[PDB]
């Protein structure tokens, strides 16, 4: 059971860490770049007004 429990755990850790890594390295950076893009473009519209 120890070994079998350790089995279901090594896969669960790698799967959870992979999802966490993607949020940190893919999804949020992309949200931050989008937000910074929006902020810049909004100031550009303010200027022409």
């Amino acid at each position: 059971s120890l070994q079998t429990s350790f089995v279901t755990l090594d896969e669960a850790i790698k799967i959870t860490n992979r999802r966490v890594n993607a949020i940190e390295h893919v999804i949020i950076p992309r949200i931050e770049r989008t937000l910074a893009y929006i902020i810049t473009e909004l100031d550009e519209r303010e200027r022409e007004e």
Binding site: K14, N17, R18, N21, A22, H25, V26, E44, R47, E48
Partner: protein, 459 residues
């Protein structure tokens, strides 16, 4: 010449920011230069940017602080800023206004050229077909420099773009297996930066072939948009009238853009992006396009308009509009610098728009183009593999992916890393290219034809 006496006016109508507006002016001329004296004897100059009837708008270079309304005395030279040029300007140091600052005399002119210049007739312009050997593998291999090409270094504050430019000045030769006259416009920089280049030029033993134009951070911001024109105007004299090969380096062009933006705001011109004038591109082209060879004359002008990218934003109008005008860029970044890699040149976002003609059979080696293209593919893929592995882990990679990580790691330390005084030939650079390409089996080198792999890959 102009034999008629010039007129002097005390008719200033008013002052609004950097612009002094005169009235009662006889037949105002557009883009003529006016000399003005302040009540305390200070002398300043400016240019008429607008005429209407008896009125004229003068932009004062030194500034409008202390300009009076009743005692200010102005005189109109009667012409545009034509500047004295001579061959013996090499070895002299000038300020951004064209005056000497090396305790030598004023320029003893051979002629007077219009600082605005003239566009070169595209029918007589001759396409560049000669390569300059920069000695930097990151450039000579994957982004070659032609003689007459326009290649700025895109950099960022704190990066050693001044060291790279200095290095290029000393070890820039030809691949025809030569002394370039260097014109260095130091604008918007501190004393230490200007002294760095001046000292390096003397250390290189080449100072007699170097003409400096300095406009430091504590100098007027309006002169900062004629300094490039002064440097290039001299370059045109040397290159197209005296058939001297000239290398013109313009320091952080962003100080030019900021000086221009200030003028644009002052004159309430139509903005484009980030507050810069909608004509910023046209103005930059006026500066940048003063380059290249001309058919029938043995001179050339090569430019390196290095610029700092605000906040490392590659889409900022300054690098953006420059990228549209110049034949590509070398581009350095912080990801290489933060790992003590020199030169910190990132090949992926870089390009040389004349490389396709300056390399290959009769120029360097026939496999040059093939090696470069495959190295680009392998380098970019290795970066893609890191982007994946950062999430999936090394265990998720196969042998096809580890090869690109091995390539990427060996590529950066063997190909890019050199050192400030490492001068490699173009042939050595290609040989190194092959040493990295031989990391992969022939079947994976898909950018290179078998007519090339069969000859070079086995070695």
């Amino acid at each position: 010449y102009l034999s008629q006496p010039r007129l002097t006016y005390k008719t200033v109508s008013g002052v609004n920011g950097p612009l002094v507006i005169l009235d009662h002016v006889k037949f105002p001329r557009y883009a003529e230069i006016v000399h003005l004296t302040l009540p305390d004897g200070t002398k300043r100059s400016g240019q008429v940017l607008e005429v209407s009837g008896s009125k004229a708008v003068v932009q004062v270079f030194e500034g409008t602080s202390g300009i009076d309304a009743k005692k200010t005395s102005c005189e109109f030279t009667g012409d545009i800023l034509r500047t004295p040029v001579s061959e013996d300007m090499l070895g002299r140091v000038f300020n951004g206004s064209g005056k000497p600052i090396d305790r030598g005399p004023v320029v003893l002119a051979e002629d007077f050229l219009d600082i605005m210049g003239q566009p070169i007739n595209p029918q007589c312009r001759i396409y560049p077909e000669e390569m300059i050997q920069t000695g930097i593998s990151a450039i000579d291999g994957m982004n070659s420099i032609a003689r007459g090409q326009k290649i700025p270094i895109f950099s960022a504050a704190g990066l050693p773009h001044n060291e790279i430019a200095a290095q290029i000045c000393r070890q820039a030769g030809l691949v025809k297996k030569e002394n370039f006259a260097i014109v260095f416009a130091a604008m918007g920089v501190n004393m230490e930066t200007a002294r760095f280049f001046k000292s390096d030029f003397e250390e290189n033993g080449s100072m007699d072939n170097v003409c400096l134009f300095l406009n430091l951070a504590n100098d007027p911001t309006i002169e900062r948009i004629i300094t490039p024109r002064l440097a290039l105007t001299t370059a045109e004299f040397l290159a197209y009238q005296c058939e001297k090969h000239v290398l013109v380096i313009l320091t952080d062009m962003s100080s030019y853009a900021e000086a221009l933006r200030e003028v644009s705001a002052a004159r309430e011109e139509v903005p484009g992006r980030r507050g810069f004038p909608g004509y910023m591109y046209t103005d930059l082209a006026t500066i940048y396009e003063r380059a290249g060879r001309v058919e029938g004359r043995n001179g050339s002008i090569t430019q390196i308009p290095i610029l700092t990218m605000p906040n490392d934003d590659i889409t900022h109008p300054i690098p953006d509009l420059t990228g549209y005008i110049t034949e590509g860029q070398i581009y350095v970044d912080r990801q290489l610098h933060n790992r003590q890699i020199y030169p910190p040149i990132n090949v992926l976002p870089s390009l040389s728009r004349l490389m396709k003609s300056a390399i290959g059979e009769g120029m360097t080696r026939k496999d040059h183009a093939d090696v470069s293209n495959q190295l680009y593919a392998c380098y970019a893929i290795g970066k893609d593999v890191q982007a994946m592995k950062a999430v999936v882990g090394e265990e998720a990679l196969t042998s096809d992916d580890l090869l690109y990580l091995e390539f990427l790691q060996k590529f950066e330390k063997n190909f890019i890393t050199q050192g400030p005084y490492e001068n490699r030939t173009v042939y050595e650079t290609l040989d190194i290219g092959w040493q990295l390409l031989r990391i992969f089996p022939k079947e994976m080198l898909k950018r290179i034809p078998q007519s090339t792999l069969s000859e070079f890959y086995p070695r």
